[model samples]
Target chain A: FPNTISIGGLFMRNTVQEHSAFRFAVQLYNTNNTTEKPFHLNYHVDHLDSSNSFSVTNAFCSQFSRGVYAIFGFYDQMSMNTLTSFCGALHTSFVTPSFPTDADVQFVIQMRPALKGAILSLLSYYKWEKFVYLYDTERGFSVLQAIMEAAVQNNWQVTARSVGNIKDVQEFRRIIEEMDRRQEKRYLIDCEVERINTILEQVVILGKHSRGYHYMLANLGFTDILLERVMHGGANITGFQIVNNENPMVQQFIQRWVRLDEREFPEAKNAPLKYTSALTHDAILVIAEAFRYLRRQRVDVSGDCLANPAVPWSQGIDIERALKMVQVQGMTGNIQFDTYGRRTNYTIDVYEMSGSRKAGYWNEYERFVPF
Target chain B: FPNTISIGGLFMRNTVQEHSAFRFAVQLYNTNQNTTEKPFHLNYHVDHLDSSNSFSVTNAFCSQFSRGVYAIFGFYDQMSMNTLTSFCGALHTSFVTPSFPTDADVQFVIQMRPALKGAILSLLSYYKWEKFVYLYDTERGFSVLQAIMEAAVQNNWQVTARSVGNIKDVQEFRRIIEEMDRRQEKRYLIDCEVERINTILEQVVILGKHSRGYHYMLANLGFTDILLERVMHGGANITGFQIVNNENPMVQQFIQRWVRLDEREFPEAKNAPLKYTSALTHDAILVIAEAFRYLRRQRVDVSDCLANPAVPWSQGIDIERALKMVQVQGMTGNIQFDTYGRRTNYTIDVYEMSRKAGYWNEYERFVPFS
Candidate 1:
């Protein structure tokens, strides 16, 4: 009891803005993700918009003489990579919903679905022989590259390429038509929505709405307006779907958002929110579970919490060890980190979006539509 | 980050058992409930179960203290009235799943559907009766009481003294049947299954083989057995109708059991395990999510993680603040605690089971049967 530690959390704004779904996911978690009584936390930074998390990070280190027990935050892969390294140097345990970048060599846990695992699920479910990924090179090229490499390992026939100007619909249509002509049954569209919408409209025009022609839209654009537009048009387009985590809270959040938006802009908010909040919510849950596990083991005191049991603390600290020990249950399903700190929450929900107002309304009537 | 405190949670084996679903409702979250998620002193007797939990109250206390979190159990009302009082003292945070005893102030949450809500739904769906009810007392009383109550509420019928059990089969039968007999353009017998099957069978014999009678059963053993036996005897005197809860997981389990045990001995192991697993899995997921919210605040310390935020301490010792601020996403849905730690998740699935099996399964022999 004397050693009862004080746990701290920060809700950085910049981290959230960078990850569009951050606030939405948090709101969903707060409003819908539990059956039992709510949990009581010691401290939390509800403000999730800022680049100066480092100052908050330093404040934690200097304030608690006994050293804080654990720290949780919502960081993107890059920010998390940097924060974890800093925390590792300070010998502080950290947890969050961010993926482990190659540089993250500190004790950190993530509750979100692993990017690689999701891509693998996409490949497996689609049985995609020829994977043509059309990503926007400017924004998330590195992330797309990692996803494509994972696909290549699966012996997938992947055409790892990107389009620069997704905002231009004509160019997007031209590029998609070329991919369509190749007769690739499965298309892995990894680009932004502006380009994705162009492809979706083209697919509908091609009259290839059968299950034979499948598509996997791999992106973190669940709330993207373009995706929402096409998904509202629900036809018999089975197997053509977006692959993402299926955490129930995410679905509830989407439902709540639809209800709210429908109230605000009845006509414009005709489409359902076509994204999964599971990754965001589950990411946080997984980190909490992992931190609890590490603390019970008395590993939080020394920098050894992130230490590799395999080799001695010989060279600097092993980032992989810190990353590997964390086992989380992400929104998609299970979150087990591999040797390289890659999570294996390989669950995906495949759904096709429709466009026509009648089709959308009919789809809403027949299915559990969540805008 | 020296000030960065980490909060860790450990599970404990302190279980608070409750009786009836109804009683468990009221006695939840009272002063009597046992809340033991704190570390224990060496002198304390603790029962260690596993890495996450222990059995003994003392060891459970110590392990809990080490974990620095709150463990939850239960408080059911149908449990013996005396036993309920004892549990109140033992539980720290008791959640009742049914009828809550008005006196007990246990911090409880109900899982079972409210009686009134269930009654309303049942009445509206079945019998199409806006009103009807039967009154009965004593021996033949319990069955008659339940049936009549359900039927009346469903039909929106009010209670009457004359509605009490009319035990003399012939005499009571005359009152309704004789009246129907007078206006017989297209009259048919509608025997409510609550009456004894033998009594109904005797009535059919008296009425004659040519007379058509309709029998309504509640899909219980009494109705199914009588209907099958009467039909096999070549009576051709009655048509049977039945109603049962199609969506209740318990019913599904029962049907599965019957199919598996058609010839072999009944397997005792197949009770509510499937449903229990579903509920428990959801609960575990909620726990994990809550922990994650605590960690995100960078408040590593468990106690400080759950303390009042106004009394500011260390920078990272704010998990307590975060716990209050953060909303945990649980598997069952969203989890937001009420003032007394009661969580409200508003989603319940209802189902209807109809007897659509016979026609589809035995279609090939329909001509001969018809």
Candidate 2:
């Protein structure tokens, strides 16, 4: 009969809750847990610390390549980058649902919109004509650079306003003062959480608010605690919006969260959560498909198949071979990777979060549109 | 009586027949022209040129500052870069349209979409989860990388695909042969004109028949000729398609081309003619408003205005100033520069092109609400 496939999934955990700065661990666990349907596959989950950047994640992904036909789920940008490097080293295939630095690697695939798409959707909707962008120059300048470029193409005028509050708050004050002098109405504040909140609080104190002025934020910076504090200060900010990946199943996740925290974290309990779960789910499906193809080709080594079905086979498969072998119908919709290992189609959604307990409603826009 | 604002505008020829590449030039012209109206003061136009880079353009821009409150349209990236380098020395406040190397410059008050936006728009419309992206490493890779990143974000996939090929016919043949051997269903071919046509020819020979596959292209490559030639050879091979900026007015430009080459290129004339004149007209109106603004502000002190009022200060004294100073509605609707110097709220039209009459007709589609 047919050989059932065993798949492996890797994830991260914040090791030290209190003092762990960006602490995340990777765990590769088995996906196929079936009682009746005999889907023969065992997955190994690897949890690693998030100390290094993209290169380190690529290194961690290599461990699963023994006989595996494909690899899946290195969540963070660093891990994704690490997975990319690992795929390059092993010539294995990978698909993720997170962010990464560049698009040069071949075996790596992402099933969700990168930060660039996330921000543009918001800009297009707001019809922002001019934006004063506040960024952290120390990190992800490439990503920030990409954001500015997109703003320009949309014909929007953007001024790189501030370089976040890295050391001195005066730098932030200077940027705000200059923007005020120009009477720049629209603002795009993109920075990490604590820093962005700090800057926004100061903006309120500086009386920089003009009539019809608005601010757009990144999802990562939009935690409830931060948003509540920023909104409470009586700033003239008309709209506070951020871009996020939305999947229908996210409602269920929110419901579950509410059930678990109806007491002390009650405010967060009913708070709706929108995630790019389709991307996450699709990412797994892509690797699963890739593994199935390897198995069908009879090229998957037994040892790799047992450890992680998604790991790339060692026999060396080229772009054409890998693409032809894998066929998956992911959660988002159909899953296909181009020669560049880019997802051939995507289903994207933009979600809006309400302040109250009302579930953050969302709408699915289109398939295969840029994230 | 309100003093006549003399706003200065500058223009430089960077590349022949490259309108998009002329962003820095056009932007310099627009911003300086716009600012000279009420908000600042004076209106004047000073159009100049030098070797096409940041150094020369910035120097020319610097010179205009002493005469007028501000200058517009250096229209050169290299010159803008040079101006930015010595902003402390020049100490001139200016608004540039589209020629900043990075976001490091502080002198420029207004700017348009950075290089990344075009790439992102391209990826969202053309590359995100599409079938094939045809690119040549030598000619188009750098331009395509930004969009490739968009594709990664859209699919939640990492960017990891590297297969290189030259414009060599044999190399393309080998690439296809290898693809066939692996049974790959999709491909992204990134290349310029010379290589694109050659690759199309090879695809026809290799795929043998038209099938449901994807194809994507950037506008600069200009593959309409290749597509037309292949249609006669029989049904072509692309099933799905995505493309980057078809900047408005392409149709009118094509029709003008047909008439000029009527006898010389009669085959092209027979095609349908419908230009995106609306968008081009919109762009023009927006620019005129800026001129009006410069006039009201009495910002014009440059030589061009002193020599001929109709040419540089052509719009007017008070009326032009009001136009520039006030947020008067223009062709592109509300005209304003954000802190980043990009157009505040311009709508980008996405289209699907259909070949007709030995020419191309672009059909506009609703921008997927993202």
Candidate 3:
């Protein structure tokens, strides 16, 4: 009980399978540990019913009441705002490998590069002149603002429009045709990776799936989207990968991931490990390192003294600072954070669709560049 | 009384003193009337509304509304738009604005500038830039930035942006430019004023950023004669759009006459080139005149309109619709509007700072809001 560190994991229902893989990776790391301060992580899975602030607040309250030393998971826009406010108020450390809307929030450590910085670096590398930016939700627009602000000073012609409600195929087609009429050949799409297949299917239906069109998917899980048909249609597809598949750590992670039961991770049998799983694994390790540092400083990380509302546990601040000060070789590559908890000194692997591949079959990703 | 339209004008104390030249230009046009429509009379008044509160705006509106004027021309900002909308909508009176941040849905208010929407896209298309960086200053820039952002998504250009500090911060501007330089981003689109532009380029030169690889497009319409001399010999490409075409014969004549006016009559108008505001004000008068003529042709008596609670004057709506319907050649060129009172179907002249020409030269005219 003294060696155990209770961490709370909040995952969307859609990503529950990945969450399980995440839990497995944490357990596997703990079992294989050789460090003297080997810590056991107990996670709580809170399945999100709907992406509303109220539901997210309830989840955070539940996690706080359970006395989690730290909370880890992917947060959508609604939950990200909710978590930032709640974590700051309660002095709870929240670590995520997700794109955070606000990077200035305290007690939240983002493992991913700030969306604006990453996109700017990527666009510079590509030498983009003019492009259409398609986003889905309000959160998407918040990230897009950085690109928009950059476009104003850089003299790049950017047309940013929202594709509301991805389920509406008709609306998607209408926007695509509008782009075609304007002779827009390049696209930078930011949306949930799951909705990508549907959007690309409509792009193919409109006869835009040819050598002329190019798409830069902004999601980290872009490769996970089934793009076999889109690639065969002769369109150029590009994406960013936080987790390098070629890395030895990731290769081992994937091997263990694929051998897991299909019921736990549906894609485990045939698919490689997702970026979320890799980051989740790294997040646990990061927290473990933070706890070790706290232990060295003679700080108590035990769960019994964690729930005082009148005064925050001084250990919480030390752990949060320690997390910010951490530098580790993560599955996503060299993971580091600035004083603001924004990921810095990191690299994102750029991948592109190279050649024709069979329907619903896996394609080898051609490594384009790293930024 | 046979063929005359009376209109009221409201000018803020700060902007009113500078508007005397504009009033002179209108009067000169009315007196020289060789046109089809009869000359109309414009009654002007100045208000000390520099930092105008809603109560002050309401008072200004009551003074103009009580005079039974057919149309009103004035400027409104965030603090005043609400008052202008409430009174104008209730009175069914039409107001034409030259300032931006205009209400698009308020059928009674007409905005003169083409919506900033398609302007940047047209410029980029003309320049054939494959990629660029956008640097914006403040919250005031979001509307213009939104159009560029929408265009970036629709066109798929390699575009990115960052918020440099406000125009006043010379250090922050230099810092951001240094980062861009380090990143090897050569193309820059600056969305700040000419003064701030001076600070940015001064820093660029101090940092010894060579001009050969750099290209900058100024988004401000009144950007000429500021940093043209410094950037011309630097080998960097500079481009921008001007709403006022100084080459037009009418404009040249206006400038000639403006230069000869008595010093007291044109205090700040002696040697300064016509501001975009002046040109817009000049066009606003012409637009109102043309709209009145159209209404007269439709058999609506311009003089008969009055403020009545029961009837709410259908003539105001007819005149406003007529204003939307009218198209005329003016200082800004081919002035027109869409149903939403946003200027459209017009061309904005694109100008480039040519090292060869030693001045800003007309490169191409683009129809951005068509």
Candidate 4:
């Protein structure tokens, strides 16, 4: 009744593009359908900052013109407004594995826990009455706003500051020294994973590695960073991990990632897949599953659904509804969305760095909290 | 008996340059007071707005906070203000700011201006203007306008409201104003920036709607003198409130000292009348000094008082409590604060545009607010 279900993967990061390609290959190989109407993924990479809204809009438009039933990837603040507005108006589903902000649109589904709610929950659980909030970008302010409001109600003292660049270790150290002088022992840091090691190293260098100091990181990729040096500093370091590395399915996925990297791109060989890559892999599976549901419903989805400036395709509403109704277990845990497209049924593994050390095992001190 | 007490002023715009010079002048004037052995010093910096993050504010604050400041002064948006309040509360440092609506529970931050809700209601009742339209610009503008609407509810007045979204087009504003005109709404309470005020008034003039029975109340304190001249003789009644009383001797002396500064160094050092922000900045410094003097009378050693985490200095808390206790007459008139460091027991002067004089003249003064 319909042609192959076509989807688009609009990626900002190169690593996401590679992981998405691998997931597409796996889905094709694992398809149990005897008919020739298989799912197809169209991938496009636009390496630009989130502030380049014009280019992002153009890239999304071209993909829509190619008749993509859904679009998935990471989006930043500037591009997010455009993407959500376009998706809502066109009745097309836009799924993302990125950090979630407050979205009122119906068609934009976020596959990760909203950062603001997660931070508020963590702060309330720890009873953190006083701490310094260090964020790196404006993208972090939505979460910071929630934390500040919560602090007001709880009478917590929070000093929030931001750093423009992660490479500014000198400036970062100066801020740390001031906080240290004020005798602030707890810190909540939100930054990119690539800069976490440098920031923590500077913290250790500044003599803040004592037993009293504690650092809570807000990135899901915190486990990808080598924290053995910081653990040796005798400070308490804690973070959240969405991808459980011990899962049998994840181990198999890692093997495939490593082999593909070795054969295709040697520089990324032997590297563990980041949390975004795992989420990307899961997003592909979810899209493929949604296509299977459309086929089962006998929906005619093979019409010319190309992008039109004046009118939107009526077929997209059914595809979007089908995507919202489908549920599956993926790399990020139970994959589901509420009627509003917010992922509320996901799980996050809380991990802490203990003071134990072994000769050969770098991850020996890292322990995941049970339950 | 003790070394000089230091304070810091953080400013967001070019007004800081003028405010900082006034602070330096006040410090010098106090140093010349032969009655006192302990002196005071003022430190200030201009922090620019960064849309991406709070890095600029962090850098500037760290530079000043490390130098051991007893108090700081500035007005910031909601986010930065919260950050500064938390930092100051943790370190037992006093933060003095002008009017910005924040949670009443915040500690260690002194709001040097009173809420404008009472002041607006008083002026409204004085005129007996029962029916009016509340036109606001942005979301923040709506909060201030909402206060007026709430007051109108208790008083049982007909209040129509609308938001001139972003105010990018003058024709749109004129359309709204003309619709109110058709509805026979004579009174308008405009809460927006000074630039938007100019735009709205210009549209009023273009539409030939400036006549008797039409009244306008400007909510911004820094209403430019140039714009008032255009509407003074147009037969429309324009009224607002002024926080600064320039007739005070302290204000005159400060203005004289500011005039004598080298014009090249202080290019904005002309004898233009000081606005509420400049007056508030001056009063903020005076409030700190007065509080310090109170602490000294109580035999508190402020020089070596470093905020300790294990045991906060009782003397630091005493100094902060003293700020709420001390009442002084400054350029802004009867500067006093409540327990939460909000300005209370203050007076706001009501003024009206005089058609004969072509200038704003004080018609009545609302004082000793209950």
Candidate 5:
């Protein structure tokens, strides 16, 4: 006998495409007649913002506040720690298509490539022994902090510079003037997509995007924006793109995304095929297959987000063990996980904007092969 | 004024630089034989703790109290602060800090951070942004909501508030947006980050409501952090505010030394302007230093926390009175206090999303931005 298992979806206002992908993944999973499925997934969705620490936690509770087993989707870097701890406390399986954190919590599945390692590999391949690390507060400092530890173990000189919000035109001028004062040519831009573009635009505005200047964008969303102008600039600019757009599955996903009807879910229509969307799609597939293994196991899930002896979901650990073993071809290519629920086996497409766009790849258990 | 007057300081691990700025201000004030400052030297006693433990802070304060340091400085935002504030009140030991007062009744304490509520209310009045939905993150957003609600009652303007802090899910975000569209309220007071603001506007665009009729008062301080190109092209009026004035020559001088401190202690700040909390520490030290000039040559007094007979600092009232009376422009703007020991003389620069329409000040009211 098959039952409908309640899964949870949490998203912020920014990752609406990811939200659309999450919805579409379930539709694709539930409607697939060719596959032998166990329990059907009925997802309850919620939202999160970076400012509210408990926004996603309360949203997660709103899910497990129902009779739900596994949860999936996205949270801000700030709100993720709370949910990771919350998921671990309740012994509930939680999957996300977000940037990976160093959280050692059990039953948490992160669906993106381990970026810190990928960026390090890319940096070592590029022969950038010393570069100024320009970072914003949105997990940029933490990323930079990890890089500093990496720099210590491996021999490298990494100078850290915090890039804060703009106050005035003079502040913009001062940011430039400070750059001139330091006289550093190489920079590692550790910020979000918008901030990365902002910094690049600033460089372009100040006419500093000339010869001898190079920037490494730590953001994985290298292809998110049209960098035709910055791409041909004299300075070196490069970033990582996790999505292989040429992949058949990815192309099919894009075709299907554009074909989605606007009446019911308009967010999917004309939605850009971003890594966030791909990650969400992959995350759902992982959890769906995990539930696929749980048929005849009689793993009925029920719990709340509270630290009491009575509410511990007994089958969550085994469900997560099954989730770790899921190896499927997803929008981001071969999707699998280590026992810690991290995407250690993955490909990171590194795009270098040196006069023109060039794509090289870094993957686990392989040396970098420059394209 | 008491020569070599001993003030106190307590810093948790996270904000040890608040402790640094306190010490630096004292030395900068004392070593300068050049400035027109006839004040006593600050023989400061500073305590550093790894945590903001209530027990540890009380013990630190108890030790400072016994040493005749009547006034203390440099405690940034921390939990269990109210317990210490109540302790400071009972002992009559003045606690000047950068931490926001959680409630109205905590006495014998001064705040360095400007009252964002007043400037926000003034901006609301100036722009006539009444009768709008407040899209708040609902955590640090409580005070602003309090201010909005208070003014809504007094001015008899309608308002609505919704917490959209769970920032990730767009469907739920659109559900809220659709509700707004159905209700026909185009004006929204967005009190979250640039990311939320960016996405909310994007959701509005996708819903075909992102024309000239849409109005959003961006309540966060760092609205300029956002790339305003998309929304500006979308034709929505996105407005925001900034507290610090970078154009001032005074700011230029401060930024110069802040740069020096950066190069000295290394890249913790990376020449980013002094944080509001650290700046408050400098401002706080200046306030007590200024008050000591008019402080009636008062010597410090000793006190006891657990003594059977309660011992309180008698001269603390003199320090408190001189503090409210003395007004000076410091790092965080005009550092002046009202009768309730709240900051009143502050300036907030207002911005419209191309942006910069005007600025709201405490005394001067509103001035059009150039």
Candidate 6:
């Protein structure tokens, strides 16, 4: 066990998938990693209250005390802000299946595809000159603002509204009535699956989508929502799916994942893996490879944040550099990072029908291409 | 000289009073504090940057860390407070702040501003008013209205919200007043910037509606913040909250010393009733230095951010723990903190007629009249 190296995970306790996937990935890596000298991997996982910055800080420092080379899976923005700072300070790496703050490029790797580019590229490919952005207020305004800024540069006319909370049926009718009265059809919806489903159902009752209404969803998990009530009419529902179920790695991951004890990982008993869980599995693969590279280079990782001289796991940044250079096909497909540690040169499968089948793919290097 | 503890202050470039007041508090604390820690001198270093730059502020913070500071005090607006809170919390260094997150559940950062919603609502109970017209401005208004309406649901109070976007012209102001007059809406809760309140209040005087029964609770920080010279001339029954009470002996003593210190050092805020931010900044430094008093040791260590392997202060969390448990009579009334270092149980002076009307007690859930 002297060869054992510990990686930490920061997760929200509310979810079963990402937390369980992190444990699953470490379990797979420890048994299956191609490192010399037994090369055991130990993982220290911590859950976040998400709002409590104090506990979030302590969580990282506690891991730093354990000399964890890298911490993974902090998707919450507020907690990530603290993690970004903490990781940079301690020279410890953090791998996330989340968006990157461009300025915070220290000892970090993002596995999730850069969404701003992906979403914007899809819009460009579809040849949509103008669109209405119907965004939910709970989802934060940053995404909408980013899209709006891109629209300005791309010379696209955009009308946006905070009309995602479909609380009452009349409120739903009132929104569709205005859009119908104006004959405005092309739309982009950024909301949760529940609200997205409600909006689609409202479109049906109002017969709004029966007349060539084209809708694109900003959610990555677009196919996750049921569109059965929608799309029998002339409507075109479009979205991008990141998880490729056909990938052999994904199949292997799901095989072992489904055989997991239901008592421990309740959701893994089902073969269908969640997007966050897939991202988490890929993130661990990315970090484990980086640690292997460090082992090859004979780079030692040891830290004590409270130490007088403060050993900062000197190779933490090395692991970050190693992670960015790695190109592996995992659950999310072609996992890689740019020099800045941002996920780039990635591909996402695009679905254009309510039946939720992939018709094409959008990639970072090029525009969307049809199957 | 041996036990000289260092703390940092981060300020925006514009403010002269707050920066000077920070140094003044530490200078005074070194001599006046009742702790037996030798001479108790403090090495105070302040870094000034523009309000919105996180990169510059982070570097400035690390530089202070390089020089070794046990704690840091900041007067940043919410725009940059999150990043500052991030770095501070990450390193386990305590940050004492004058500006309210009005919003942060973040750590290692102690809020000096008292929770205003509870205090503002408690003022309502004392006046025996449940139903009132809540007028909020564009910026910082949504949060004000949202909190009031949230409490409205629980407390079963009817609050009619009227959007009065930055009272730039008399058109909307006059229109709302006429609507309220038509509705006979006597109780008005105006939560906006203080500068425009006087302009709006002057109209109530112009309309000859001051004495007839109009009470406006200007939901603002300082009662003295916007010297009520014009409003005091009329009997409109105006109300607001003041954290800095000259009535308290601590403030009575603070005013005399601060005014003297201002004349000698800055001489900018000499005649004006001190701003709420200034008092909070002074309280922030005092609270930090007081937290150091509980450490009961010397030569406290600090971190080296740029070090290949950065050093961290070992007993840093103790300073943070001591700060949350710290209770003292600050210049801004009785300064105390809740479990997680958010300000709580602090005294806020509720001014009814621009005079000392009453005080708000959070635990008691009631306001006491003077």
Question: Whose DockQ is greatest here?
Answer: 6
Better of 3 and 5 by TM-score: 5
**Number of the candidate with higher TM-score, 2 or 4:** 4
Candidate 6 global lDDT: 0.72
lDDT of candidate 5 over B1-370, digit per residue (tens): 3457788887776675565677677877788786457455668787876655433444566677778786877563434355456667767778887766444555678876666676677777877876788888753426777778668978988787787887578878778877877778888888775567778777777766466788877776555555566666768787777666667676668667756765465343444445556667778877987887666444433234544235566777777777777789876677888765677777778777655688777767777765
DockQ of each: 0.01, 0.01, 0.01, 0.01, 0.02, 0.09
Q: What is the TM-score of chain A in candidate 6?
A: 0.87
The TM-score measured for candidate 3 stands at 0.48
Q: How many residue pairs in model 4 have overlapping backbones? A: 0
Docking class of 6: incorrect
lDDT of 4 at A202: 82
Interface RMSD of 2: 24.9
Query: For every candidate, how close is chain A to the native chain A in TM-score?
Result: 0.54, 0.62, 0.86, 0.85, 0.89, 0.87
Models 1 onward score TM values of: 0.33, 0.38, 0.48, 0.51, 0.52, 0.64
Error of 4 at B156 (Å): 3.6
TM-score of 2: 0.38
- What candidate 1 gets wrong by more than 4 Å, as runs, is A1-40, A44-68, A77-81, A99-104, A115-127, A136-159, A164-170, A177-186, A192-213, A220-332, A338-341, A351-371, B1-370
Task: List candidate 6 segments past 4 Å from native.
Answer: A33-38, A102-104, A136-143, A153-157, A163-181, A198-211, A232-234, A298-302, A311-315, B1-98, B101-142, B145-257, B262-273, B280-370
Candidate 4, position A125, lDDT: 64
Tell me candidate 4's TM-score on chain B. Answer: 0.84
Score residue A281 of candidate 5 by CA lDDT.
Answer: 83
Docking class of 1: incorrect
**Candidate 1 - chain A - TM:** 0.54
- The predictions' CA RMSDs to the true structure, in order, are 26.9, 24.9, 16.1, 22.4, 22.0, 9.1
Interface RMSD of 3: 21.5
